[PDB]
């Protein structure tokens, strides 16, 4: 009847994203304000790192889902405590917010690769739809997978530090 709460966490650790246009998003907390912008960088800076969680998916045999020995993972990004990344689907955004600890499915993103070291973040409830930075802040671009391959707004990078 569910196959989508009752999972496990694989592995956890700090990670900031970077547009592929050597910059880094800066993510701003006021006192109850979410400003956000890309800043360009120039040196070996610790800028903002974002807490990445994977999560693996879980589907039935013998019955619906017909895997192909391959299935999707997921991906949380948590730059503060409580506050998760979820893909407003009202004004095409992602805004930080605070929700239970069963997280929904537009808080699990189905993490794609693109190039050697680059990666694209997905929305599990809403196929077709990737984050990545619009004008010059997060938010959901809506990219194909094929009708549009040349879209560097939406690759993202991650550093180990």
């Given at each position: 009847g569910?196959?989508?709460?009752?999972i496990?966490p694989?592995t956890?650790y700090?990670?900031?994203?970077?547009?592929?246009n050597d910059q880094?998003?800066?993510?701003?907390?006021?006192?109850?304000?979410?400003?956000?912008?890309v800043?360009?960088?120039?040196?070996?800076?610790?800028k903002?790192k974002?807490?990445?969680?994977?999560?693996?998916?879980?589907?039935?045999?013998?019955?619906s889902?017909?895997?192909?020995?391959?299935?999707?993972?997921?991906?949380?990004?948590?730059?503060?405590?409580?506050?998760w990344?979820?893909?407003?689907?009202?004004?095409?955004?992602?805004?930080?917010?605070?929700?239970?600890?069963?997280?929904?499915?537009?808080?699990?993103?189905?993490?794609?690769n693109?190039?050697?070291?680059?990666?694209?973040?997905?929305?599990?409830?809403?196929?077709?739809?990737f984050?990545?930075?619009?004008?010059?802040?997060?938010?959901l671009?809506?990219?194909?997978?094929?009708?549009?391959?040349?879209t560097?707004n939406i690759?993202?990078?991650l550093?180990?530090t």
């Open positions: 569910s196959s989508i709460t009752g496990s694989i956890e700090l990670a900031s994203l970077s547009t592929y880094s998003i800066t993510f701003a907390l006021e006192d109850e304000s979410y400003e956000i912008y800043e360009d960088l120039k040196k070996d800076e610790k903002d974002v807490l990445l969680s994977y999560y693996e998916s879980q589907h039935p045999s013998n019955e889902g017909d895997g192909v020995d391959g299935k999707m993972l997921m991906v949380t990004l948590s730059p503060t405590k409580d506050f990344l979820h893909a407003n689907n009202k004004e095409h955004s992602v805004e930080l917010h605070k929700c239970e600890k069963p997280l929904p499915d537009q808080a699990f993103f189905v993490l794609h693109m190039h050697s070291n680059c990666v694209s973040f997905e929305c599990k409830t809403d196929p077709g739809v984050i990545g930075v619009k004008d010059n802040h997060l938010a671009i809506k990219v194909d997978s094929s009708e549009n391959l040349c560097e690759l993202f990078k550093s180990e």
